[PDB]
């Protein structure tokens, strides 16, 4: 039949995919250090012989919202949030390094510093931070310097042991990977530490998802979705009527 | 009246193409820069500003454009179909083809280089400039041209379109064919 049936179907299909991207945003409102995902549609025309009447649209992710997340003051010593722009460099389960903004850190039984996702926290030597096992008081600095008190030591024996690797690259050069870690679009790009990134210890950075912004985008995808499915029915209606040209 | 900075913003797309179709603008500010393509079709604009820069292609089909001043930079093509241009200035940096079909064009710059196709279809031009170089297809159909210069260069096909050519260039190397 007419190709407008599939031209509208290819549009309704993308609206559902855009709806899925907004659904993931609203599910992650309470998530810690979550960067909102933007949804956009690209107009692609079928170039060739004939009148230029058919143009497809596909939904794609143009970028992410890198605005500062909501800061939650918790009073916990091992809670860190990046003041302004900046990232925390961590290595995932496989070992590939990446940037994260979740500062819900913790100390394991061996002293290794991890975050809430389990990623190991990189240090001054581009290696995971391993603090002494018998600690007494962890006091993270504003610049990322970790000053710990050995167990049984006097309060005046406060010494720095490591400095968290904070990286502030261009946000437009970062893409979210398959596990929520932002990495460089260009492969084999070294993550260079920055001396301007600051860590506000004792607070946790929340999500930056604008709940109303997603809701008002939802009510427009639904209407656009319903208009296209009416086009599918009216293209079906036209073909059924034209079925009476071979009756003879 | 004339286009302002705020009026410019209301005729620009996401990638930076200025659309002035049917808009009542008479003159553009000097030193004008366009991020992408420029469209001044059907406009009462009779003159393009000096120092004009277009990051894309200039579209002036069926417009009132008459004068383009030298120094204009156009990255894409120039489409002046149906406009009121009578002469082409010297020193225009054109990154694409030049379509001058159905224009009152009479004179062309000497040793003009067209990086794309050239059209003089149905134009009152009497003779082509010496040393003309065309990297694409040349359409002279329906024009008043009947004598080619001593030397010319066309890297594509040459379409006569109906006009009769009597004096062919002495030095001519053609990458394509000649069609009547």
């Amino acid at each position: 039949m007419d190709r407008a049936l599939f031209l509208a179907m290819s549009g309704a299909k993308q609206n559902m995919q855009a709806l899925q991207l907004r659904a993931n945003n609203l599910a992650n409102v309470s998530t810690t250090g979550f960067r909102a995902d933007l949804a956009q549609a690209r107009s692609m025309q079928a170039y060739g012989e004939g009148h230029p009447s058919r143009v497809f649209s596909m939904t794609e992710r143009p970028g992410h919202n890198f605005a500062q997340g909501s800061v939650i003051t918790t009073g916990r010593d091992l809670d860190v949030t990046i003041e302004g722009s900046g990232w925390i460099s961590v290595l995932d389960h496989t070992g590939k390094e990446g940037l994260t903004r979740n500062g819900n850190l913790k100390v394991d039984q061996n002293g290794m510093l991890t975050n809430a996702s389990g990623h190991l926290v990189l240090g001054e030597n581009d290696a995971p931070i391993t603090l002494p096992i018998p600690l007494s008081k962890i006091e993270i600095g504003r610049d990322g310097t970790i000053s710990v008190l050995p167990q049984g030591a006097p309060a005046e024996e406060f010494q720095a042991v490591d400095r968290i690797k904070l990286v502030k690259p261009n946000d437009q050069s970062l893409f979210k990977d398959t596990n929520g870690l932002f990495r460089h679009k260009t492969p084999n790009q070294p993550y260079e530490a920055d001396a301007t990134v600051s860590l506000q210890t004792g607070a946790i950075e929340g999500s930056n998802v604008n709940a109303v912004g997603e809701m008002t985008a939802l009510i427009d995808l639904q209407r656009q979705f319903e208009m296209q499915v009416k086009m599918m029915s009216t293209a079906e209606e036209m073909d059924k009527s034209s079925d009476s040209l071979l009756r003879m | 009246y004339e286009l302002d900075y705020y009026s410019k913003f209301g005729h620009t797309d996401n990638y930076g193409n200025l659309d002035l179709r049917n808009k009542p603008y008479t003159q553009l500010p000097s030193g004008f820069v366009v991020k992408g393509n420029l469209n001044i079709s059907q406009t009462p604009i009779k003159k393009l500003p000096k120092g004009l820069d277009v990051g894309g292609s200039l579209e002036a089909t069926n417009s009132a454009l008459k004068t383009i001043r030298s120094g204009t930079k156009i990255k894409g093509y120039a489409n002046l179909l149906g406009s009121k241009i009578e002469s082409w200035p010297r020193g225009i940096k054109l990154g694409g083809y030049l379509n001058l079909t159905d224009t009152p064009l009479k004179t062309l710059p000497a040793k003009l280089r067209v990086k794309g196709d050239l059209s003089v279809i149905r134009t009152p031009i009497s003779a082509l400039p010496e040393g003309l170089v065309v990297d694409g297809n040349l359409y002279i159909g329906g024009s008043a041209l009947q004598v080619f210069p001593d030397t010319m260069t066309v890297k594509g096909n040459i379409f006569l379109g109906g006009n009769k050519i009597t004096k062919w260039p002495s030095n001519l190397t053609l990458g394509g064919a000649v069609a009547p």
């Binding site: 991207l21 599910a27 998530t31 794609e60 992710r61 996702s117 398959t178 | -």
Partner: protein, 52 residues
Amino acid sequence: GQSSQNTELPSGLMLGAGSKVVATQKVHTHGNAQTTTNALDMMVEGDGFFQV
């Protein structure tokens, strides 16, 4: 399941699967002291756990 390359194009569009609660973290912040007259109740100021 091929990934990466052009993530800002329709070809490389990536969709999430939602959210989850990974851990319920215990906040072992030292609490305030209650002064009672019973002589058999005790308290630890600072780190320490009673053993039973």
